[PDB]
Design a binder for this molecule. Structure first.
Ligand SMILES: *C(=O)[C@@H](CC)[C@@H]1[C@@H](NS(C)(=O)=O)CCN1C(=O)[C@@H](NC(=O)OC(C)(C)C)C(C)C
Ligand SMILES: [Zn+2]
Lengths: 180, 21
């Protein structure tokens, strides 16, 4: 049915730092998109096909904190700007899109869903341009097709004068490629 | 270098609900 989303915050500044250092995270996990932080930065990771993915330019080679200490990346592809860990216990994965639709829907770190028109393999245009401050920290989040299946991961925003009209994304296909 | 940390989540799979009292 219709895409709708909500956000919940599970950790504050201080538990985040401590957890970053111990690499030990005991909180229960839910949902399909995880809000993630480093020391300097916060963004999104999306679970597709049992793996939790996000952008290399944010995570780098870093481990992810888990109930069992740090967990090493399963996939690392610098050219694709794509990184992946095994999906946390309790997360739920998105299904890759197979309908080839050109009407995409980007899920934001604030849990808004904004319409995007597909204009290429890896680029889409916003139907309503937005201030860049808005999309900040949404990198790593999903572009969905009308059925709610994953088409791609938000990679970068094309901004002019602080206003975004287009986004570049990593297509689901490149995920599957990276998996091989 | 520190581990990436889950600080929050977005849930896509919830559907319309009457808010409980
Ligand atoms: C993701 O959340 C983007 C902000 C909208 C992204 C940032 N990623 S993150 C995970 O928050 O570290 C880093 C800067 N981001 C960009 O999209 C920058 N654009 C960029 O590299 O664009 C091209 C010129 C198209 C390659 C923008 C905002 C300056
Ligand atoms: Zn589809």
């Amino acid at each position: 049915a219709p895409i709708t989303a909500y956000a919940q915050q599970t950790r504050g500044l201080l538990g985040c730092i401590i957890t970053s250092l111990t690499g030990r995270d005991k909180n229960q996990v839910e949902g399909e998109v995880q809000i993630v932080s480093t020391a300097t930065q916060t963004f999104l990771a999306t679970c597709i096909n049992g793996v939790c993915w996000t952008v290399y330019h944010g995570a780098g080679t870093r481990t992810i904190a888990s109930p069992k200490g740090p967990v090493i990346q399963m996939y690392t592809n610098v050219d694709q700007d794509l990184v992946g860990w095994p999906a946390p216990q309790g997360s739920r994965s998105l299904t890759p899109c197979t309908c080839g639709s050109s009407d995409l829907y980007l899920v934001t770190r604030h849990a808004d869903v904004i319409p995007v028109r597909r204009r290429g393999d890896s680029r889409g245009s916003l139907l309503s341009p937005r201030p860049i401050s808005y999309l900040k920290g949404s990198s790593g989040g999903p572009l969905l097709c009308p059925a709610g299946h994953a088409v791609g991961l938000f990679r970068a925003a094309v901004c002019t004068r602080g206003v975004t009209k287009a986004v570049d994304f990593i297509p689901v296909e490149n995920l599957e490629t990276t998996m091989r | 270098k520190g581990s990436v940390v889950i600080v929050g989540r977005i849930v896509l799979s919830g559907k319309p609900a009457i808010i409980p009292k």
